[PDB]
Symmetry: D2
Subunit: 386 residues, 4 copies
């Protein structure tokens, strides 16, 4: 019994921001407005970076999908993370989940720390290791559930409760892995629902984009100021392409759910898999939390292969359908070894504590036929452990 | 007697980065690679690097006489990335007349993170030496400035800044384009552009560009490009690279039309003053000819009268469009005190000269005849 | 109990033509090659119109989806039709299904007939009104099942059986309403599987394109010659966008089927609806033939409203989710009155024979929430027929 | 003394069809409208029906091109070829077509191998020599197709003279393929032609990234028929291509002026080169119709044709030593292209009834530096006869 699916999601995803009354042509699809400037002083558009129709339409839609009042689009998820951090000042403290996306973790420790920001990496899954790390100078808590790539799950409503009792602290949930179709962090008390739209949101492996949804007025005004002032904004063509991808987010995420579950169950009953981590599986440590907190699950399946890296690498090389590549969340199935690839930027003593061993494989389960996905995992595991 | 034109500019703009042998199809125009990811067994992730963006960066670097070039989601984004080169405790010296957003970012955002910001008239070369501090690591100048178009001796300024310590000198070369000015050849460390303006030139791309020669400076900037992620879309990269192929022939037409407009306006009885680098009446005109191969289409002038006459003039224009931004093929007109520089403080505006009658024009590529008559009829309307 | 779903459809739609090894970057998604020309004499590309990477990738993938060896992309579904007709010559005869897309009807009747082509409109569901409409001059049989908009269904294998006994005649099936996820005319004996990719194929209401899939080697060579010779070619960017929509065709069509079924069922038990025409409903005259010929059904639901033209307009003007507009097959629900809009080009006495009356309404059911779609239809019918 | 330049070309190329009042946003650049269909029957609604029938971005482009041709109407097409095919759909079974002896290979092939199979009689006539034409004109002639200058021997046809002759025989259409000159240098309609047709793929777009055709017209009935055939045959261009092509028009005037400047220098350098037998270029006085060119044109494009001395093996080793000129098909871009038509454009024994010998080389002179282009030609000819 997961959370019941969010009402009107498919309808809002297809229609919010797409009202044909906005355009003199009454086009059913909003036009791509490339114009950098607009004629004045003879609607309310001045300069593309400060706001432009195609981006605004996508922002109105993504907000609705999050159940938020406002949304801001960015040139990437990374740029969305950097813009949020600019909400602070020198002397403030940032608490970050210990297992996050490599670049998020790389940004905080190598860049944000150089500008008077203190950053502490804390296992926020564990209840009051978090409150032990909170001080009166904490201003931002950055959690990511499920985590990348070990997919630890955080009680958002509980973690929000811990966070909001210490004055003004912004809780951010990086919702990249689940999409708002499966999880609505703002409904669970978080202050900011943030996405790398590069993944599931656009869903078509052809747009680098970030998204930031928010309810609080002042938080929005400050974020909105920073969107114009820092200029890390997306192309209107990319905004159009992402809005296009959104129109199928509901049917894609449900197919990701069905294929991901099938893959996860196959891996768990397989004689050559040590362990499977999938929030939809009962064997997941927080599976009951997931069902209370989500309406389903994406196609991110993480597992440990038996043996050493020699077997992990023969497995990847023998895949004929999964593509050995970085990134996730598209229609095509991707496989990757985080020790060498996506989390190679995190140093190894932090790899051993989070669990990113050399046998940890991350799968992005795509929209191909479940038959073909299992058979290629079958054949490729038999070649690795023959 | 301007500087001689940069050799091979047209040939490099059209061919650098555009080699057909990069692609299996041997296409003469580089394809637009939208793919975010790449199959592994030298591209990893689109934000990290992708063909279409790399071809544009290679081509821009050639136009700047640079070894390296980085592309960004906007001019503003490029500035933010450049400022991320520093650390808490550093000091920044900025031109007192700078693009409003540059002004706003330094004064309202960067100062929040342990960076000291000082606004200094770098046109006067001795106020810069007084401002330079052992904690100064970045000097951000714009020449010509926006919108009063003060001109700075780039080479002389570079001598001052580089004589002691590790200090980066950045020249925002938006108003000129690398076809008319090469800050790196004059001693700047970074040649930066809002490509949204002249570089792309077609009023349909938001983009920034950063060109550099120092290899250690490039390694830090490249790290920040990937780490901060203010990256441009590959399709925008394509369109900008498409715009570049006509930069030489547009900038030449921008020069001819801008000089025509500037000369007309100065002999017009309803105009109190004209500021155009190509005019001998410009305070630094001889410096410009020593520093530049020509001039762009940016003409600013003061209309006679009050804010009322400035408005009547702007509302009677029929070819110039009342709009923000600059550097397109379309002629644009704007009142900076109400529009692009309302973010700048009022008593900073009246010391800068940005009064109620200061008008900035972005002369486009329309027929010179039509542009001159549009200005004539509109000035007559403002002063019946 | 429909035909079992075609095997490997999703896998082929996502991967065929999309092999990273084609590109020096090994990009997972093929780049968009705009270049009109290519460097020679240092690649089998000369000039964009004869062929180009982005278009070729799309043609290879569509062919896989059609179970075909070849495919040809065109600037529009209309342009595909025009190109196919150029296969003929002066003196030949064309047999066209009597209920077709308005533009197909008008091109044969107003344009092709002026160039030595004879056009006969025939009910090919009646398997001879077809047989001696065939003459020794018959070179092309053009059918479209289900028809637009009365959605009559033709036995393709049976029709193909008749057509290929009389020598060298080409049977074309406009498979727009079904897409290759639900129906494979080539597997059923047609010579050509033709599409208005503008509809379900692309599915995102932002691309005008036609597709032509074929097996016969000589037939392909003549079509490939004409694609280059007539130049009705699609833009590489449109080729890219259509290939992008193809990646979700299977999940899209499945939701179209479930929503379209629900809309059709709601309408049939509704007291203000005279008659529903939906191939998935047991009430359709060829419902059983459909389940033997197809793996499912699209979102096109046609019905008759009780009353007169006034009620049809009141209903249409009161829809708040369905958009009163032309075309079909996208993610958004559409509604339209063929007599006044899409089939106003076919003559008025030919619409009363086909049943295209002033009360006939055609729905293109999209991918919104079923609940919201049924309540829009409910509310809009009550407005036309209040208590 | 060329024709004086057309009077508002640059202004109209930039503003005609670009009016920001068309859009709710007052964007100064027209949005790209992809939408295939448009909402109908709203309160107070008369607009757009279906993208193929017409759409904003295409309409803005057609308005702009028409202004550049001095025409009342323009129609855009998927390709120059599609424009040709659409134009001949104006006829019927039994009509006759007169076509220039030397035309583009595709135009030539379409009439012989396709249009003739549908009750259309095709006669190829040297229309430069005044009176093989009315010797060819019958009461069944309905369309005369000329192309001046020709591809690639660049014969020049008196358009006004040829139009005067043709219009003496009642109902008969004169069509001029204005690809090589562009409306910047030659206006067929002001010279008496009925249709001005382009392969916009070439100079119009001028960026080698768009395949497109254009036909501009003044006569009401000719336009109405042509407009019907546009929607009926559906050989329409993408709105994105329509956008890109209109974007390209904005620099057409400064591009063609640099093409003229570089083409002239290239033609003059080649003619006084010891390894060049003959140069054909309408700008040079040595051209047979140079005086006619100045009477009907405002200048000249960058197409330079010449014969190299020796024959084949020496003709192509010149092409292999070009390192700025690219060996490739097509023309009219910012790029410099070189090509041998006997093997490439007209490899499809009319080789020397046309004069298209084995030693004929066609150059498309780009917008690179004149210095580099001549040095590339000099070096490649020094390598030609070392």
């Amino acid at each position: 019994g997961f959370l019941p699916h969010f009402q009107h999601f498919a309808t809002q995803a297809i229609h919010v921001g797409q009202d044909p009354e906005q355009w003199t042509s009454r086009a059913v699809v909003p036009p791509i407005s490339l114009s950098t400037t607009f004629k004045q002083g003879a609607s309310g558009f001045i300069y593309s970076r400060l706001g432009n129709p195609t981006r605004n339409c996508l922002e109105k839609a993504v907000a609705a999908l999050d159940g938020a009042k406002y949304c801001l689009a960015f040139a990437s998820g990374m740029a969305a993370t950097v813009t949020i951090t600019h909400l602070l000042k020198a002397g403030d403290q940032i608490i970050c989940m210990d297992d996050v996306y490599g670049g998020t973790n790389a940004y905080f420790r190598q860049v944000a720390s150089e500008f008077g920001l203190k950053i502490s990496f804390v296992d926020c899954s564990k209840i009051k290791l978090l409150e032990a790390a909170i001080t009166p100078e904490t201003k931002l808590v950055w959690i990511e559930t499920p985590t990348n790539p070990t997919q630890k799950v955080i009680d958002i409503e509980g973690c929000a409760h811990i966070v909001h009792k210490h004055g003004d602290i912004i809780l951010v949930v990086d919702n990249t892995f689940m999409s708002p179709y499966f999880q609505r962090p703002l409904a669970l008390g978080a202050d900011i629902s943030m996405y790398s739209a590069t993944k599931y949101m656009n869903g078509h492996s052809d747009v680098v984009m970030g998204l930031v949804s928010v309810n609080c007025e002042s938080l929005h005004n400050r974020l909105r100021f920073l969107q114009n002032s820092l200029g890390a904004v997306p192309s209107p063509i990319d905004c159009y392409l992402c809005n296009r991808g959104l129109k199928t987010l509901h049917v894609r995420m449900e197919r990701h759910f069905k294929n991901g579950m099938a893959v996860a169950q196959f891996l768990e009953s397989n004689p050559w898999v040590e362990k499977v981590i999938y929030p939809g599986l009962p064997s997941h440590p927080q599976h009951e939390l997931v069902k209370r907190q989500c309406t389903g699950c994406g196609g991110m399946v993480t597992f440990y292969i038996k043996g050493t890296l020699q077997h992990a690498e023969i497995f990847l090389k023998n895949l004929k359908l999964f593509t050995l590549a970085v990134s996730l969340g598209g229609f095509e199935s991707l496989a990757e070894l985080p020790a060498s690839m996506t989390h190679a930027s995190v140093l190894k003593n932090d790899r051993d504590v989070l669990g990113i061993s050399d046998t940890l494989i991350r799968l992005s389960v795509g929209l191909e036929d479940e038959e073909d996905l299992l058979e290629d995992l079958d054949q490729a595991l038999k070649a690795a452990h023959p």
